[PDB]
Copies of this chain bind each other. A is one copy, B any other.
């Protein structure tokens, strides 16, 4: 149990709610933000629609939207994990670890699960890699202010495929959900992280929730839903 909502504009913390803002958790599918940067920077990923890769082993697909061909745009939209894993297999562990350290991403632990030698494709899936809400903000701001050693194309294409919608006031919303499992019934924890931008202003945010009990719905969706209310409220205060 415990939540966090952080919102930060440049060096200014505008909102800090909840008790968990310095607790590290697995990033789950929010790690696709970092994978996008690696994919476009390495040249494995080309643009919003290329490359398109086909699905394999459909019997292990728990969401029907994953059973179609995927490209970087659909990858983020559908949160398609198998596309992430095909990408890291192409990158290889050396380059994968190189990017994780260059991004100073959370605890930077890509060793994976014990007895599995599966860090390359599982480090971010309720496993070794762990990041706090404060550390999500730190990473996202390095994207926003282009402080990372990656190409201009990596920044632009990552931004393009993270776009979600326009919020009141014209604040454009970019971000990513992710659900992980706390380590019997499944105890979820959920993220929604990203930023909103209007004119020359960018506000980075991170929302996390940790369930104490099994739940009817994906924790990421509840985190996103709560976060959007908190962002609506913040925008109203900002526009006074």
Q: A: which residues have CB within 8 A of B? A: 63-65, 67-68, 74, 77-79, 164-170, 217-218, 221, 225, 228-229, 232, 235-237, 239-240
User: In the complex, what residues of B have CB within 8 A of residue A217's CB?
Assistant: 229
Contact in complex: A63, B225 (CB < 8 Å): no
User: In the complex, what residues of B have CB within 8 A of residue A78's CB?
Assistant: 168-169
Contact in complex: B221, A65 (CB < 8 Å): no
Partner of A170, one of B67, B77, B225: B77
Nearest B residue (CB) for A240: B64
Partner of A77, one of B67, B68, B166, B228: B166
* A168-B236 contact in complex given A221-B228, A225-B228, A228-B221, C-beta closer than 8 Å: no
Chain B nearest CB from A198 CB (Å) reads 10
Nearest B residue (CB) for A235: B65
* A168-B235 contact in complex given A225-B228, A229-B217, C-beta closer than 8 Å: no
> How many copies of the shown chain assemble into the complex?
2
User: In the complex, what residues of B have CB within 8 A of residue A68's CB?
Assistant: 169, 239
Q: Give 30 CB contacts A-B under 8 Å.
A: A63-B168, A63-B236, A64-B169, A64-B236, A64-B237, A64-B239, A65-B168, A65-B169, A65-B235, A65-B239, A67-B239, A68-B169, A68-B239, A74-B170, A77-B166, A77-B167, A77-B168, A77-B170, A78-B168, A78-B169, A79-B168, A164-B165, A165-B165, A217-B229, A218-B229, A221-B225, A221-B228, A221-B232, A225-B225, A225-B228
Interface centre among A78, A168, A229, A236 (most CB of B within 10 A): A168
Chain B nearest CB from A90 CB (Å) reads 24
Nearest B residue (CB) for A169: B65
User: In the complex, what residues of B have CB within 8 A of residue A228's CB?
Assistant: 221, 225
Nearest B residue (CB) for A238: B64
Given contacts A68-B169, A218-B229, 5 further A-B contacts (CB under 8 A): A63-B168, A64-B239, A65-B236, A77-B166, A221-B232
Q: How far is the CA of A64 from the CA of B235 in the complex (A)?
A: 9
Q: How far is the CA of A168 from the CA of B63 in the complex (A)?
A: 9
Q: How far is the CA of A77 from the CA of B221 in the complex (A)?
A: 22
Q: How far is the CA of A169 from the CA of B74 in the complex (A)?
A: 8
